[PDB]
Amino acid sequence: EVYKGDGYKVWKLEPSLGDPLELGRKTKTEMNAMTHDEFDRMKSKGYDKLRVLLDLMDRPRLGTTVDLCAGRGGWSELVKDLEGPKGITAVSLWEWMADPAIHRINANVKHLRPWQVDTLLFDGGEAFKRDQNLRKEENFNDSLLDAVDAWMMQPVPPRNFVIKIQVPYTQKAIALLEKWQVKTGKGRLVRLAGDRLSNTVMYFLSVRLETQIRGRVTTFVRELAERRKDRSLTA
């Protein structure tokens, strides 16, 4: 009851006014300019984080599961403990610190074409370092969401999904998320509490619909910048 709800797990993100792209670029620029003190002072591990996310989703039965950009296997390992290794397929480019019984495919996620699954996991995306054009990090993560898009738009989409959204305030990202809600009839973008302030990572979970994604991302980026200032500043 009062257990079921979130809770301090995720931020509350009600929609608000603003351009998410510009507020997102604004706090990225500010962060890039922070000194060594400010930045650090505010700056297989995913095993636990996926368990939290799946607990929020009411612990659904996973079934046939593809884990995209599986990396070291943290997410695949949790599925195997939850349901055995038979149903999991792990895709990444190659290392692998998870159960070797889990089936793996060495392939570029942007070239592997989708197939039908019960559960779609994606934990890809990368945070670029300050010495970069802002648009290059946005384009790179956009192109990864474009690949996930083909998994979500196939004739029978994933019943369950956990899709990391590394850079959620681009037009591609927001348009991709709104399209996936229409396609699947569900989906909510969450900000896990306790994620490092140094990224903009959100997660798109296959729970009951929550719309106005564009305003909630704006609220996220505005709220994150304020918390970045609080932590970076002393006294």
Residue numbers in the entry: 42 to 84, 99 to 149, 155 to 295
Task: Tell me what the authors wrote about this structure, in their words.
It carries two essential enzymatic activities: the methyltransferase (MTase) and the RNA-dependent RNA polymerase (RdRp).
The crystal structure of apo ALSV MTase was determined using the single-wavelength anomalous dispersion method and finally refined to a resolution of 2.5 Å, with Rwork and Rfree values of 0.209 and 0.258, respectively. Clear electron densities could be observed for residues E42-K84, S99-W149 and E155-A295. The N-terminal extension region consists of an extended loop followed by a helix-turn-helix motif (helices A1 and A2). The C-terminal extension region consists mainly of an α-helix (helix A3). The overall structure of ALSV MTase is similar to those of the MTase proteins from canonical unsegmented flaviviruses.
